Design a protein around this ligand. Structure first.
Ligand SMILES: [Mg+2]
Ligand SMILES: [Mg+2]
Ligand SMILES: [Mg+2]
Ligand SMILES: [Mg+2]
Ligand SMILES: [Mg+2]
Ligand SMILES: [Mg+2]
Ligand SMILES: [Mg+2]
Ligand SMILES: [Mg+2]
Ligand SMILES: [Mg+2]
Ligand SMILES: [Mg+2]
Ligand SMILES: [Mg+2]
Ligand SMILES: [Mg+2]
Ligand SMILES: [Mg+2]
Ligand SMILES: [Mg+2]
Ligand SMILES: [Mg+2]
Ligand SMILES: [Mg+2]
Ligand SMILES: [Mg+2]
Ligand SMILES: [Mg+2]
Ligand SMILES: [Mg+2]
Ligand SMILES: [Mg+2]
Ligand SMILES: [Mg+2]
Ligand SMILES: [Mg+2]
Ligand SMILES: [Mg+2]
Ligand SMILES: [Mg+2]
Ligand SMILES: [Mg+2]
Ligand SMILES: [Mg+2]
Ligand SMILES: [Mg+2]
Ligand SMILES: [Mg+2]
Ligand SMILES: [Mg+2]
Ligand SMILES: [Mg+2]
Ligand SMILES: [Mg+2]
Ligand SMILES: [Mg+2]
Ligand SMILES: [Mg+2]
Ligand SMILES: [Mg+2]
Ligand SMILES: [Mg+2]
Ligand SMILES: [Mg+2]
Ligand SMILES: [Mg+2]
Ligand SMILES: [Mg+2]
Ligand SMILES: [Mg+2]
Ligand SMILES: [Mg+2]
Ligand SMILES: [Mg+2]
Ligand SMILES: [Mg+2]
Ligand SMILES: [Mg+2]
Ligand SMILES: [Mg+2]
Ligand SMILES: [Mg+2]
Ligand SMILES: [Mg+2]
Ligand SMILES: [Zn+2]
Lengths: 110, 220, 74, 102
RNA sequence: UUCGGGUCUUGUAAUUGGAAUGAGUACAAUGUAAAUACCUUAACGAGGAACAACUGGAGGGCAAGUCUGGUGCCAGCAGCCG
RNA sequence: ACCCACUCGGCACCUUACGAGAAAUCAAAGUCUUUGGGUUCUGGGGGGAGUAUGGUCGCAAGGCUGAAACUUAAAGGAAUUGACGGAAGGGCACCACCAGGAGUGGAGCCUGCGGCUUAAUUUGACCAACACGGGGAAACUCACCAGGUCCAGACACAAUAAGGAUUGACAGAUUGAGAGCUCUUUCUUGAUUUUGUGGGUGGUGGUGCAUGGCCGUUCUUAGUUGGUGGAGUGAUUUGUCUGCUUAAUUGCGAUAACGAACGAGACCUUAACCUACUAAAUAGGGUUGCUGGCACUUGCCGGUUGACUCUUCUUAGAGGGACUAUCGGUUUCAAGCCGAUGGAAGUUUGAGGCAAUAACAGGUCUGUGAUGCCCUUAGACGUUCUGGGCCGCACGCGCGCUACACUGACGGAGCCAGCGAGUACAACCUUGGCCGAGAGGUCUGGGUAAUCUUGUGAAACUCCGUCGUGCUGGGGAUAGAGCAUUGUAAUUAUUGCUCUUCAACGAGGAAUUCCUAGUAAGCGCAAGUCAUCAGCUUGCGUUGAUUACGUCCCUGCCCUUUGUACACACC
RNA sequence: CUCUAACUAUAAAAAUCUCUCUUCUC
């Protein structure tokens, strides 16, 4: 939870840490500790989500740790700047339409 | 702690602006409470203790889904009690959510006199009862310095209430701890819920402090 | 997924070929001429160089500094 | 149902209070009765580690341990699956008055 | 500026002293019909104060071990769950 | 007789909880811890058991009365979620069926299992094991077996010990050995050692039911989850739904639900379309030279690192292009579904890659210097060397191969591809010219790669002939001999080629597999393995269809409803 | 602010099931 809190503090929009092995017991276990949200399928999985796996040597054996971090698309250099389905509509600038007749003249220019 | 908190829930706006000195008017005017820091701000002296966490188990096609139901009790030891019941996946999350629930459900008590009053009433005003499931709980006024003659769970709840002497009489399947605590809680909440004589006279029907301060709520 | 039988041996023993701790081979090698000249014994190695004594087995004097080089009849 | 389970051995000889016996019939409740090769019909109990792990049936030479206080009963330990039974007959540790072949 | 005075206290040490005293002996006296014993009291009577506290238990119920070694659904434990 | 407003009494009913209950529910099962209207009769855990016995009524059947000894930690009630149902409903799937196509199962061969045998036939998987562990093992790979070596036993301490800890050793005996393995002797070597104690390494030793990682499967379907919010005392539930719609929990919507997250899609690779752009002797084309042949009219077909020019074809970047477009039907007219036109493409455009929560005692310690524990650690389970086996054979089973011939076999002749790959610290792809019948060898070449192999001039196929219904020129196993090739080593036949032998086989029982368009099927080719080896496998292209374009009947799957004594869940 | 009309039509057979049940504390 310290790790995931640090990841959120760092500004990424989603973290997950998975620990499997002999968690304090003999029968195998695998607990997941996630926050934010993570995308699993679709090529953006490689585009943003960094992943690492490590083996930890404890007295009883080996614990597998998997870390997944979903980098913010906004600050992703060298790749798409947003998710595939992220639609950004743009606010149209407003104008007053009362100027109906409004004859105008410029000076002639060469 | 970074307690930023944009005000929600106009009551919250009033307390944040400090227009609510403490909970008595709230409880007086039966205000709705939906958020906990209202209790935190008004009562800065809530002590808490997780009575029991139970592994609650559901059966699905792929193994079994396990959650944890915490039954936590919060109080001031000076006449305010709340009880939170909450299930969640992780134990710590369950405990925190239960804490929030308990602070949401703070209820007052009527510390009465066993007879021939002195300073600082110790016992309960009147015998009360509460039913949850098969758990029927009786609270009886007790002579000063008789202690809290009660089962450990409700005894701790009484201690959190601030009461010093009460007699208890349970019936049913009190083994079920959440039912017992919930019954004792509704009973102790019933302590006001009993028109005693000395409380006869018509009151003045004070204007709702939450009403007359409407202009400080609903942030413009 | 298998339990192994004990390696029973139908072979008596083979022990390390212990080197022989020779007591003062140099007196065997040399011969002193009464507080003066000293002679060597049984040959000197020409293939290895002066000072390396050779081996006496029979009908052949043998090397052993460069062992395979010199084993010749004399 | 092998996924629920724990998932060329050698014979073991009797040792000072145990005997090879031939089951004569299989009794209920998990019991059994076997002739020990002494001229006696003893009552064997199917021991733990054995109950529903490895089976046995009639006409099977099988090791059984006696209980020192009550000789009339005994508890079966180790089974022999029809090929080292011939070896048991060969080595002559037990009398060959009982041959079992199909 | 790291300090570190332990400056004030608490504990922990097979380190180390001198105090105090009974259980036991026992002069006596008292106590009793006679006596024991007590209540007093000479002189004796503590260093590891060997002048030695056991009885159950440490998964839950229920306070206390996921320490070591042994046995390996056997021996056994367990009022019940195990 | 009806209508209205009644009222008294009766069977009942609906709504609700503001009362109860543990709930299902109850207008009484309320007026019960705030415990008292009057009253009878029953029960005190379940079994034993309404049984024993004695009465008592009865003809009899039997009824009423009615235990105990003893045996157990439960039995039981209501509801919740799953599972299950030869329960219901609505939808799906060629790992289901229908219409069929191709077959497999019969035959011989190959290959992998089991069994048997063996010294060893090393081993692990039993829909999701079986042409799988890339497992196409001659030495190695190595795991087993008969054997021989060596220590790749760090470091600490002690102990010997420099008058030598020790090592190495020609020749012989001995050894398969040209091993100083052991011995005979003698030499050589010098503090790195040796032998005892710890201690550590090593291990294709064991334990996938200690484990990580890994992938497989549940599960190619569409399903998951939390936050406040409501319902419940709670197990939980609603959101996640009545309907219609989609391939989709996909939407239209309806809604104690609201807004959110994953999965699906979206997205990426590939396949297609770009006379639009950018360009090109490592791709092509035109003109034009110089040349070859023919017709002779200036026409063709050719060659040619000549010159100029071009980019349609070939490349690959930028991009463009389709989103159901347009229209006609149908649709609470919305979601969409159908039909035609335009088009290149109108099934999600085709095929794919990633692919949720939860889980399996699924497999893997035999991939790992991933790894806990245990085992062994000197005549070793370390490592190496020689040889054997993993490929044996009374038998059964699974992938596949060649066939059973006339749509054929054998001769000629025609002559079209697409994915690849390729020599370095070594030695590949090999053109061409030689020779040989052939496999082959030979000498020079090119090619580190759109350049050369290469236009891989491949097969089926196409055309002309021979054969002629014959187990026949079908079929080519099983069998002798020879020539070569890789290899230190081909015997237990590596492989190729040559001759001869020609077996079994007549469309294959019950069953069962796969499949809806460039599809199945036939046909090969390239790559992995590789020194040599494929019948395997990935990919590629070629010749290219019959039959659906639907349904839950078998086998399953989604969700909903329902019932359950199930929860290790109908095994 | 006026109303009460449609409807069909199935059942053959299918018995049994050996283990192994294992924590939630911040
Ligand atoms: Mg998504
Ligand atoms: Mg398993
Ligand atoms: Mg037994
Ligand atoms: Mg004492
Ligand atoms: Mg004990
Ligand atoms: Mg003790
Ligand atoms: Mg305790
Ligand atoms: Mg009873
Ligand atoms: Mg009965
Ligand atoms: Mg009777
Ligand atoms: Mg029930
Ligand atoms: Mg069919
Ligand atoms: Mg075929
Ligand atoms: Mg066949
Ligand atoms: Mg074998
Ligand atoms: Mg499947
Ligand atoms: Mg080979
Ligand atoms: Mg070999
Ligand atoms: Mg070998
Ligand atoms: Mg050997
Ligand atoms: Mg290895
Ligand atoms: Mg497993
Ligand atoms: Mg809630
Ligand atoms: Mg739900
Ligand atoms: Mg997708
Ligand atoms: Mg072009
Ligand atoms: Mg239209
Ligand atoms: Mg697709
Ligand atoms: Mg999935
Ligand atoms: Mg290991
Ligand atoms: Mg080895
Ligand atoms: Mg094999
Ligand atoms: Mg067969
Ligand atoms: Mg296969
Ligand atoms: Mg032929
Ligand atoms: Mg031909
Ligand atoms: Mg081509
Ligand atoms: Mg060809
Ligand atoms: Mg023929
Ligand atoms: Mg063919
Ligand atoms: Mg293969
Ligand atoms: Mg269809
Ligand atoms: Mg099938
Ligand atoms: Mg159960
Ligand atoms: Mg059944
Ligand atoms: Mg039967
Ligand atoms: Zn020499």
């Amino acid at each position: 939870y310290g790790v995931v809190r640090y990841v959120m503090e760092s500004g990424a929009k989603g973290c997950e840490v998975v620990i499997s092995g002999k968690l304090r017991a003999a029968r195998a276990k695998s607990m997941k500790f996630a926050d934010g949200f993570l995308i699993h399928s679709g090529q953006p999985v490689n585009d943003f989500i960094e992943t690492a796996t490590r083996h930890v040597l404890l007295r009883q054996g080996v614990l597998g740790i998997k870390v997944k971090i979903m980098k913010d698309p906004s600050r992703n250099t060298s790749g798409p700047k947003a998710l595939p389905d992220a639609v950004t509509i743009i606010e149209p600038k407003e104008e007053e339409p009362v100027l109906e007749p409004s004859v105008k003249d410029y000076r002639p220019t060469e | 702690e970074e307690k930023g908190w944009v005000p929600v829930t106009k009551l919250g706006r009033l307390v944040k602006a400090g227009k609510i000195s403490s909970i008595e008017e709230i409880f007086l005017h039966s205000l709705p409470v939906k958020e906990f820091q209202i209790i935190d701000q008004l009562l800065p002296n809530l002590k808490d203790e997780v009575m029991n966490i139970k592994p609650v188990q559901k059966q699905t096609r792929a193994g079994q889904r396990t959650r944890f139901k915490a039954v936590v009790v919060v109080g001031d030891s000076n006449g305010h009690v709340g009880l939170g019941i909450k299930t969640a996946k992780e134990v710590a999350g369950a405990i925190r959510a239960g804490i929030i629930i308990a602070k949401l459900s703070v209820i007052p008590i009527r510390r009465g006199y066993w007879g021939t009053n002195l300073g600082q009433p110790h016992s309960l005003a009147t015998k009360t009862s509460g039913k949850c499931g098969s758990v029927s709980v009786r609270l009886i006024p007790a002579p000063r310095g008789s202690g809290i003659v009660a089962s450990p769970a409700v005894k701790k709840l009484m201690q959190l209430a601030g009461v010093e002497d009460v007699y208890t009489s349970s019936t049913g399947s009190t083994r079920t701890l959440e039912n017992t605590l919930k019954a004792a809680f509704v009973a102790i909440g019933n302590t006001y819920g009993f028109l005693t004589p000395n409380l006869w006279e018509v009151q003045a029907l004070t204007p709702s402090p939450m009403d007359v301060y409407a202009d400080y709520a609903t942030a413009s | 997924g298998k339990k192994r039988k004990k390696k029973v041996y139908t072979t008596p023993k083979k022990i390390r070929h212990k080197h022989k701790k020779v007591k003062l081979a140099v007196l065997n090698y040399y011969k002193v001429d009464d507080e003066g000249k000293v002679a060597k014994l049984r040959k000197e190695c020409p293939n290895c160089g002066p000072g390396i004594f050779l081996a006496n087995h029979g009908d052949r004097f043998y090397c052993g500094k460069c062992h395979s080089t010199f084993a010749t009849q004399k | 149902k092998g996924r629920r389970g724990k998932n060329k051995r050698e014979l073991i000889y009797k040792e000072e209070g145990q005997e090879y016996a031939q089951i004569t019939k299989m009794l209920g409740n998990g019991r059994v009765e076997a002739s020990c090769f002494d001229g006696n019909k003893r009552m064997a109990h199917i021991r733990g580690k054995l109950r529903k792990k490895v089976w046995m049936g009639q006409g099977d030479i099988i090791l059984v341990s006696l209980r020192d206080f009550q000789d009339d009963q005994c508890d079966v330990v180790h089974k022999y699956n029809l090929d080292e039974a011939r070896t048991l007959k060969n080595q002559g540790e037990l009398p060959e008055n009982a041959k079992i072949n199909e």
